[PDB]
From a paper:
We characterized the evolutionary trajectories and selection forces underlying emergence of β-propeller proteins, a globular and symmetric fold group with diverse functions. Propellers comprise four to eight blades arranged in radial symmetry, with each blade comprising a four-strand β sheet. Second, tachylectin-2 is an immunoprotein that agglutinates foreign cells by multivalent binding of surface GlcNAc- and GalNAc-decorated glycoproteins. The repeating motifs encode both the globular propeller fold and the rigid binding of saccharides between propeller blades.
First, we show that single ancestral motifs inferred from the sequence repeats of the extant propeller yield a functional lectin via oligomerization. The best performing sequence from the first round of selection (Anc1B library) was subjected to error-prone PCR at a rate of 1.6 mutations per motif. Selection identified a single mutation, F23L (AncB1B), which was incidentally an ancestral state predicted with low probability; this mutant exhibited similar total binding capacity to AncA1B. AncA1B and AncB1B were purified with a sugar ligand (GlcNAc) resin and eluted indistinguishably from WT tachylectin-2 in gel filtration, indicating the formation of stable pentamers; additional peaks corresponding to alternate states were not observed. The crystal structure of AncB1B was essentially identical to the WT structure despite its alternate permutation frame, with each of the pentameric subunits cradling GlcNAc in the same binding orientation as the five-bladed WT monomer. The repetitively observed mutations of selected single motifs localized along the subunit interfaces and near the GlcNAc binding sites. The pentameric single motifs showed a bell-shaped curve of concentration-dependent folding efficiency, indicating that native pentamer formation was favored at higher concentrations but was simultaneously compromised by misfolding intermolecular interactions (blue lines). Single motifs unfolded in a simple two-state transition. A moderately stable oligomeric assembly enabled the emergence of functional single motifs.
Numbering used by the authors:
A (entry chain B), C (entry chain H), E (entry chain F): 2 to 48
B (entry chain D), D (entry chain J): 3 to 48
Amino acid sequence: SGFKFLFFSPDGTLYGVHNDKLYKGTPPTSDNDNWLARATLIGNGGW
Amino acid sequence: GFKFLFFSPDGTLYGVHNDKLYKGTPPTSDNDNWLARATLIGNGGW
Amino acid sequence: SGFKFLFFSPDGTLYGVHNDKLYKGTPPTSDNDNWLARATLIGNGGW
Amino acid sequence: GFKFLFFSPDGTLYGVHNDKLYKGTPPTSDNDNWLARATLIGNGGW
Amino acid sequence: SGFKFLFFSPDGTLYGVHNDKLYKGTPPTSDNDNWLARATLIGNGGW
Ligand SMILES: CC(=O)N[C@@H]1[C@@H](O)[C@H](O)[C@@H](CO)O[C@@H]1O
Ligand SMILES: CC(=O)N[C@@H]1[C@@H](O)[C@H](O)[C@@H](CO)O[C@H]1O
Ligand SMILES: CC(=O)N[C@@H]1[C@@H](O)[C@H](O)[C@@H](CO)O[C@H]1O
Ligand SMILES: CC(=O)N[C@@H]1[C@@H](O)[C@H](O)[C@@H](CO)O[C@H]1O
Ligand SMILES: CC(=O)N[C@@H]1[C@@H](O)[C@H](O)[C@@H](CO)O[C@H]1O
């Protein structure tokens, strides 16, 4: 369930591994922000 | 407990607790109830 | 046994969850340095 | 997949995969096979 | 086997928990760099 990894790059971008895939994006600022729907897909598997 | 607990480079503490994502300035003593004051920035899926 | 989380803040302070409690302190530079005995207790439970 | 995955403060991605330590600039798109180009910086023991 | 935690300080030093002990050092630069053999032991137990 949820993320396997969740962490920041030093430039303040949020990265996460979810369902073996890698995502990044600006971190959310309220629970109304669906982060995973807007996050940039940057790895399609293997994570 | 928390599943993830980690800093942003601007020094904000982030944690995932009960599937929810929270941020806040880090607690400064054993009297500081972090979860009661942290900003809820995601509810579910974390 | 040991810590559940152990990570840095961006100013160089070491943070750690140990026995569900949160601690912080300047990291040790030798194994003679009992870090947990000097660390600041910043959370008494729930971590 | 990875056992650890994390940044160095200069912006380089580090990962432990199959006991090995790898680093490299993070991927920009899912067309980028990161593990295939990452620099192997440790062969075992991670 | 391997490490329980592996992470950076903001000054670029690699830290690792290995067999309950805390180590630090410049990150390895190649597979010919035996890191654990040259890392600085900074904690002998409890991690
Ligand atoms: C761990 C890793 O490098 N995985 C990459 C994946 O993210 C990328 O989408 C693909 C491009 O073909 O090459 C991989 O499998
Ligand atoms: C992992 C993730 O992105 N979870 C978000 C959640 O935090 C947010 O509360 C919800 C409604 O906006 O949308 C979810 O998808
Ligand atoms: C996870 C969290 O916020 N834990 C805090 C704890 O560290 C603090 O000692 C107490 C009241 O002081 O409030 C708790 O629940
Ligand atoms: C954890 C660690 O230090 N592992 C190193 C490995 O990365 C390196 O490839 C090898 C030969 O130099 O020495 C091992 O001890
Ligand atoms: C987690 C912690 O602080 N462990 C310390 C250890 O690194 C140090 O070698 C020792 C010296 O007495 O004090 C230990 O218990």
